[PDB]
Symmetry: D2
C-alpha cells in the first residue's frame, strides 16, 4: 500500500543568493533523472519544509575539524555502503556499518597519533550515475533508490519522483539512529576496542595484528593508570555524507543559516559534507556551480585523466577564499597508476598556496569483473593503492590526509582476498551490494591495521 | 488533491515474549482506531523493521535519572505541544519548542538546586482520545494525525492506517533534529540564559523576575570564576515522550535489547491517559510489559486504592522512578484530593515520581467560544501541589505542561494579560490550549520560587 | 638562658648579573641592620645554597595571574600578619591565617564574579622599619625577628645576623605547611564556605550578611546541579609575600632560573615600603633587577610624577601586572589624593595593579594606650578607593590587609563592637593592629557588595 | 657560627593515648643515641611546637592509595638516598632525586598498566643504626647527621642532641621544595618522559630500551589524539619517608588529629610513612610498640633470618584491625636467597586473611666490599633479586607490590655494572654516599625499564 503526504500550502532568499543559485542550476547538469518538471517541483516543495538531516553549526564544526586535517593535524576516514537501499535501511545494517567505521577509527587514531575525522557514507547515498542508459539485461539502468528500483524489470526501472521523499524519510531515519548510537554507547572507545580484540583473536591472520592490538590495549590502560578524565572516550562524532548527484534533492534540502555565527549562507542540509563524482564534475556544469554556492565542505573525485591544470581550476573555483579543508580532492587512480599520476597533481596544487585535503579512494580505480560474472575488487590492489598514495605524499613532504572506502559491517562476499581468502567462487554466497563491491567488516578492519602501519612507518 | 502517495514494501520477537504480549493485548483496549485489521497488520509489519526512534541504553539512562527524581535528588520537567501535527512538524516549530523547554529548564535547575530531567512531548504525540462520537460539525471526531485529518471534511476523517507510517517518519525526522540541536549549540546554558535575560528585559512583568535572573547570571559567572571545566554546560539531554494510545503503533515499535527486556522504542517514556487507564485494560497491560519508565494520569475521580493497584501493577519489583503518578486535579481540588492518594501510595514502600499536570483539570470555555485555561489557575495548581508535598514531607517531583515556542494566544492571562478577545489572533493548537513561550518561561520563574521557598 | 645554639657550616651567580647587582646595591639603603659585614657575609653564604622558599615557575604563573588582575579580569587579595614572629610560627596560627584568607576569598570571588589571586603576608614578614632611634623604654627599637628580639631587654635588641638563617628556616617550614594545607583539604571551597555559614549564623551582624551567604550557597549548589567536574573546587593557590627590607636576606635568596632571569626565591612577590622607596635607593634598584611581581606603597605624600617614575623604573618593558601600586591614604584622603595619581599613571599606557591598603593610613592611639584602627575607617577607605576607580573607569584591582585567624582585640569596631576597653584582652600583634578573623570576614562581605554594586 | 632557637614557654592527650605512648616508650629501644636526658628533653620541647613536615589528611590519602596497592590495583615505588646529609640538602640534589624517582615512575606506570604510589626517602633520612659502636678507623661510628658527623674525627663523632633540630629544619626545607616542584612543573608527564627519551638516545644500552620508550611515547600521543582532559598529567604526588629510628625525634613530631575525619589518633608528622629496620624490629621493643601506636602506614624490613611465624606476629601486632595497606613487609634476602626464603613467609601471611603490601628491597641483601675497598652492590644482583621476587609472587598468585631502592639523580660511582659498566676502579671517581652505595640516575632508570618488563611478562 501507500502512505500519503500533503503538498504544502518564508523571508525570500537574499537577492544575490537567489541569483547565484539560479545561475548555477541553469548550467547543464549530467546524470539527472528524467521525470516530469511539475511532479519534480511538487516533490521539492514537500522537501523544502521538512526538518533537515543536519544543521549548520555541525557543518561549521566539521569544517574546523577538516581544516586540522588539511593542516596535517588530523586524518580523515570516510566509508560505508556504495549504495544505501531502502530495503536494507534497518537497525542492524546501520549499527553494523557504524560499528565497522568505528572499529577502523580506533586503529587509525592510534596509528596516526592524531584525531581521525569520522565520516560515514550514509543517510542519503541513494543516487548513482551510469555510463550506460541501457544495462546488460537491456533494461533502463538502475540509478539508485532515489531514482528507480533495483528489480530487473522495466516498470521498476521507471524514474519515480516520489522516491525523492522516500529518500529523505529513509535518510533522516538513519541519521537519527546514527546520532542515538554515537551518543549512547556504541562509540565507547573501550567497547569498540574489545571488538577489535575479538577480531585479532578469531581472524585467520590475527597473529599478524596482535602486537599492534596489544599496544593499543596498553595505551588504553595507560590512560586509566594516569587518571585521565574519561568522558571524551565515551562518544565519538560520526558525520553524514553522500555523492551530491540529484540536483532536485540537493536544491530542495538547501537552507539559509541564521547569521548568528557568520553572515547568512546556503547550506545543503541533506548531509554534512558532499562530493562530486567523476561523471558529474564538468568544470562549467551545474554540479561544480552548485558546490560553489553551498557553505558545506566538498570533495571532488579525481581519476586517471585528470591534469594538474584542471585540478588547480577545481581548487580556484571551489576554494576561492583559501579556507583550509573546504576542498578535498579524492584521488582514485588504480594501484598501478597512483604513483605515476598523483605526484604532478599534488605539486601543482601545493604550489597554489591552498590547503586541500588529499584523500585516497583506493576502491573505484581497482574494479574488475570475475570469471564468475561478479563485479569485484582485489584486496591487495586496494591496499597497494593506499601504499602508493602514502609514498607520493612522503616523497613530496605533503600530508596523506585520509581514505575514502566502501565498507559494511556485514560479512558479505564482494571483494576478493583479505585474511579470509575470499575466492572467485566464494563471491556467490553473500554478494549483497546494490552497486559496487564493498569490503566486508573483517576486510575493512584489516585495511585499518595495514594503514595504521603506513602511518607508523 | 494536493497529495503524493509513497509506496510501502510488502526475524520476529521471541516466542515466549510474543506469548506474553498476546495475552496482555487480548485485554479490551479503549479509544482504538477503526481501520481494517489486515491493513493494520500490513502497517505493523513495516514498522517492525524500521530503525528505532530511541535506543535501549538511552532509556536505561533515563530510568537512572528518574530514580534520582523519585528519591528527591532531581526534578522532572516535561513539556511541549498538546498535539503535534504533521504539517507543523517543521524545523522552526520544533526548535522553538526545544528552546522553550530549555529556558524553563535553566530557571528550574537554579531554583531546585538539583538536576532537571528534561522530557519533551514530541516525536510522537499524534493521537488523542475523544468523548464525542460526532463533533459539533456532525463529523467523525479528529483523533490525531496518526489516525485521521484535522480538516473538517468527511474524507479526511476516515481512519487511515497508513498514517501509522507517516507518524513514524515524522517522529524520527523530528527526533533527528532534536538530537542535532541539543548536541550542536542550542542547548548551551550560556546561550539559553541569554534568551532568558532578553525575556526579563522586554517582558511586562520582567521587573518581578529580574532579581532571580541576576542571581542565575551571578551563579553562572561564579562557575567561570572558580575555573570549573565547562563541557557539561555546552549541551543537554532532551528525552522524548507521548501518550501511548495507538496500540497498533506502540506494539510494532517494540524491540528486545541486546543483553534482554522489552522496550517500546517509539519514545523514551510514555504515559497512559485518563481515558485508557482501565486497570484491567490493554494499555495498562502494555505498560506492564515494557521496560520504559511509564506515567499514569490521575484525575479527580481517582481513589487511593486504585492509585495503589497502579503501583502494584506497574512497579512490581520496586524500581524507583519506574512509575510516575501525574496529578491533574484542578487548582480548586488539588489540596483536598491529592493528600490521601500520596499517603496511601507512600505507605506501600514504593518510590514513585509525583508529577503535577496543572493543565488538564483547569480547562474552561471562553464566551468567545475558545477552549482555554487561566494562567493563574495553572500556577495555583502547582502551588497547591507543592503545599501538599511540603505538608507530607514528600517530594514535589516535577511538572507536565503544554507549551510551545510560538507566540500563540491560547491560554488567558500571564504577564501579557491575554484576554478573551486576544484568543482569536493566534489560536493554533490542534487540541488543548498551550502556554505560549512567554507564559511558559513565566511559569518556570514562579515555580522556581516555590522550589526556593 | 633557655636557648639552644645550632651550628652553621662554614657555584656563584654569573659574573655579568653579579656586576649588575653590585652596581644596584652600591645605592644607599635605608633601614638596614647594623651587624658586622663579615658576619652578614658568612650568613649570606649559608643562604646562597639553601633550598628555595619558592620556585621560578610558580612566580611566572603568578605573573600571568596578576596580568589578568591588571586587565580587569581578576581581583588580588593579599593578607596576613603585620609582623610574623618566630615564636608564633606555629601550626594553629599559620592554619588560622590561611583559613581567614580563604574565607575572605570565597566571598570576594562570588562578589567580583571573577577569579581572586590569593597572596598571604607570610613565610617571611620578619623585618620592619623604625622611625624612632630609641623606643619609649629607652631601648634600641625592635626591628622584626630577622633583626633582633621583641623582648624589651638590651641583649635581645642587639642586631644578630644569625637571625638571617633562623628567618629562612621559619619561612621554609611555614611555606611547607601552607602548601600542605592548601593541597590536602583546607582549601576545599565547600568546607571553607561551611565555615562562612557558621560565621553568618553566630555573628552579631550575621543577619546583614545572610542574603549573600545564601546566594553563594545556591551558586555552589548550582554547580553540582549542572554536573561540572569538581577537582578545581577542592584546592586553591596561596602565594607568599612580604616587605622586601633586609637586603642581606633578599640578595642571598636570589637565584637564576634554568631557562634565565633573576628571581628572589624568598617569596613569590615582595613589596617596598613607604620608608625605603627612595627612587634612587637600593630597594628600588633591587626591585628593578628581579623578575618577581613587585609592589610599592604609596602614601599621602605621593605625587603623580613620582608614581610615574616608579612605573618607568619598575615596569620598563610594559608587562601588565608586573607592578602593583598600593594605595594607603587614610579614609579621609583617598577620594582626593588618589585620582590624580591614577590619571597620570594610566596616561603612561602601562597596566599596573591598583590595590588598596586600607590599614596603614588609618592608625590612631586609643586613650587606653594601644595602637589601633577603626573598623569603619578601614571599610570607608576601600569604599572610597572604589569610588575613585568607578569615576575614572579604571579597575579597583585588589586589597592589602592585616588579618589573623585568631580572635584578637586589636582593631576597634566591627560586628563584635570591639571597644577601647576590649583592646587589653587579647592584643597580641608584635607590630600593627590586625583585623581578627570575624572582622576580616566581615570586611570581605562588605567589599563583596562594593564589587556587586 | 651558630643560629639560636628558644626553648618554648595544649589540651592534654587523651588519657588512653598518653598511657599507650608511655607504655610503648618504656620498652627497650635499640640503636639510640647516648646524649643526656635533659638536653634531649629541651630539644623535644622545641620540636613539639614546630610546623609539621606532613599533615594527617595526606597520611589518610596515602593510606587509601596503599590499600589499592595491597589489593593488587597499584604498584609502590620508594627510593632516594641511603642517607640524606645536611651538607647535600640543596636544590640541585633534591630536584635531582625527585626527577630520578619520577623518571622511574613513568616507565613503571606504563609497565604495570596501573598507578604507581611514589614515595621518596627524603626529608628525614638522617639516622642509621650500626652493628658496631667502633668503626674501622677505631672511631665512634657515624650514625647519621641527626646524631653525629661524617667527619672521621672523634669530636665530630660525639652525639649532639642539637642535631634533632637541625634535622627537622633540613627536613621541612626539603619537603617544601619537593612540594613546590611536584606542583609546578617537574612532575609534568610530558617533560619527565622527554628526559627518558634523552636517556634512551644517549645510554650505552639505549637500543635495548628504545621499543618500550617508543610505545610509551605513542601511548602519550594516543591520549592527546583522543582529547583526554590533561591536567592530571601536569602534577604527581611524592610522599615522604624514612627509617623511624631516633625515638626522641619521632615522639616529638607526634601530633593528635582533629577528629573531623576519624576519631582522634596520634600521627607521626615527621613523614607520611615510616619503616622499622632489621636491627630495631625486636618484637617486644620500643620501635614496634611505637609503630603500633601511630596512625601512619608503616613497614618492616624482613631479612634472611625471618621465619613465617615471626612475620605473622608482625602482621597481627601492626595490622590488628585488618586494614589493607597499613602494613608493608619489605623483603631483603639477597638475590641468591629470595626464591627460597620468601615463598613460605608469603604463604603463612596470606593465610592470615590480612592484606599486606609485599615490597622488594633488592639493595640491602646484595652488598659486598670491592677489592678497591669500597662498599658496593652489583647491578645484576639487585636486578636478579627483583626478578626472583617477581617469580615468587607469580607462583603464588599474590601481588608483587613494589620496590624500595636507594637511588640518586647524580651520576655517582657507587654500584658496579649497569649499561655504563661501572668497574671496581671506576668507584673511585664519584663515590659520594654518606652510607650505602646508591644506584646512580642512569642505573635507577635502567632498573625501571627492566622491572617494567617483569610487570609486562
Ligand atoms: N572522542 C574521541 C575518542 C573516541 C571515543 N570513541 C572512539 C571510537 C573510535 C576512535 C576514537 C574514539 C574521538 O572520537 O576521537
Ligand atoms: N548539561 C547540564 C547543564 C546544562 C547545559 N545546558 C543547559 C540548558 C538548560 C539547563 C541546564 C543545562 C544539564 O543538562 O543539566
Ligand atoms: N580553585 C578555585 C576555586 C576555589 C577552590 N577553593 C577555594 C577557596 C576559596 C576561594 C576559591 C576557591 C580558585 O582558587 O579560585
Ligand atoms: N598524575 C598521574 C600522572 C602523572 C603525572 N606526572 C607523572 C610522572 C610520572 C608518572 C606519572 C605521572 C600520576 O601521578 O600517576
Ligand atoms: N511533515 C510532512 C513532511 C514529512 C514527511 C515525512 C517525514 C518528515 C516530514 C508530512 O507528513 O507530510
Ligand atoms: N525503508 C522502508 C521503511 C521506512 C519508511 C520511512 C522512513 C524510514 C523507513 C521504506 O522505505 O518503506
Ligand atoms: N619557630 C621556632 C622553631 C622553628 C625553628 C626553625 C624552623 C621552624 C621552626 C624558632 O624559631 O625557634
Ligand atoms: N643544610 C644547611 C642549611 C640549612 C639550614 C636550615 C634549614 C635548611 C638548610 C645546614 O644545616 O646548615
Ligand atoms: Cl525548475
Ligand atoms: Cl471505545
Ligand atoms: Cl637609615
Ligand atoms: Cl623521657
Ligand atoms: Mn561505489
Ligand atoms: Mn492536552
Ligand atoms: Mn603593618
Ligand atoms: Mn641503606
Amino acid at each position: 500500500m501507500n502512505w500519503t503526504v500533503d503538498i504544502p500550502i518564508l523571508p525570500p532568499l537574499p537577492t544575490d543568493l537567489r541569483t547565484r543559485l539560479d545561475a548555477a542550476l541553469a548550467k547543464p547538469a549530467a546524470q539527472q533523472p528524467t521525470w516530469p518538471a511539475d511532479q519534480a517541483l511538487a516533490m521539492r516543495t514537500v522537501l523544502e519544509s521538512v526538518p533537515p538531516v543536519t544543521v549548520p553549526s555541525e557543518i561549521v564544526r566539521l569544517q574546523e575539524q577538516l581544516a586540522q586535517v588539511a593542516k596535517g593535524e588530523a586524518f580523515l576516514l570516510q566509508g560505508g555502503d556504495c549504495a544505501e537501499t531502502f530495503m536494507d535501511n534497518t537497525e542492524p545494517h546501520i549499527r553494523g556499518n557504524v560499528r565497522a567505521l568505528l572499529q577502523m577509527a580506533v586503529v587509525l587514531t592510534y596509528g596516526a597519533s592524531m584525531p581521525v575525522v569520522k565520516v560515514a557514507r550514509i543517510a542519503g547515498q541513494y543516487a548513482k550515475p551510469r555510463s550506460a542508459d541501457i544495462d546488460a539485461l537491456g533494461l533502463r539502468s538502475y540509478r539508485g533508490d532515489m531514482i528507480n528500483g533495483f528489480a530487473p524489470d522495466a516498470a521498476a526501472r521507471e524514474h519515480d519522483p516520489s522516491r525523492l521523499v522516500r529518500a529523505y524519510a529513509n535518510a533522516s531515519a538513519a541519521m537519527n539512529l546514527v546520532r542515538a548510537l554515537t551518543s549512547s554507547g556504541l562509540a565507547s572507545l573501550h567497547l569498540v576496542h574489545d571488538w577489535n580484540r575479538e577480531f585479532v583473536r578469531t581472524s585467520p591472520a590475527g597473529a599478524r595484528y596482535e602486537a599492534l592490538a596489544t599496544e593499543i590495549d596498553r595505551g588504553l590502560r595507560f590512560m586509566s593508570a594516569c587518571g585521565v578524565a574519561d568522558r571524551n572516550l565515551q562518544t565519538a562524532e560520526i558525520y553524514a555524507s553522500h555523492e551530491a548527484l540529484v540536483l532536485d534533492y540537493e536544491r530542495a534540502m538547501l537552507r539559509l543559516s541564521d547569521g548568528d555565527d557568520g553572515e547568512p549562507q546556503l547550506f545543503d542540509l541533506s548531509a554534512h559534507t558532499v562530493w562530486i563524482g567523476e561523471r558529474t564534475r564538468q568544470i562549467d556544469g551545474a554540479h561544480i556551480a552548485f558546490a560553489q554556492v553551498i557553505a558545506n565542505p566538498v570533495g571532488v573525485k579525481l581519476g586517471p585523466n585528470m591534469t594538474p591544470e584542471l585540478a588547480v581550476e577545481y581548487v580556484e573555483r571551489l576554494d576561492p577564499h583559501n579556507k583550509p579543508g573546504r576542498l578535498t580532492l579524492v584521488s582514485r587512480m588504480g594501484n598501478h597508476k597512483v604513483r605515476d599520476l598523483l605526484p604532478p597533481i599534488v605539486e601543482k596544487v601545493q604550489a597554489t598556496g591552498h590547503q586541500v585535503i588529499w584523500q585516497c579512494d583506493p576502491m573505484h580505480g581497482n574494479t574488475h569483473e570475475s570469471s564468475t560474472g561478479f563485479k569485484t575488487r582485489h584486496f591487495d590492489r586496494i591496499v597497494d593503492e593506499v601504499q602508493g598514495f602514502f609514498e607520493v605524499h612522503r616523497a613530496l613532504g605533503t600530508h596523506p590526509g585520509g581514505i575514502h572506502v566502501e565498507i559494511t559491517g556485514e560479512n558479505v562476499t564482494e571483494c576478493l582476498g583479505g585474511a579470509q581468502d575470499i575466492s572467485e567462487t566464494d563471491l556467490a554466497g553473500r554478494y549483497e551490494t546494490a552497486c559496487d563491491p564493498r569490503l566486508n567488516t573483517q576486510q575493512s578492519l584489516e585495511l585499518a591495521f595495514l594503514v595504521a602501519e603506513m602511518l607508523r612507518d
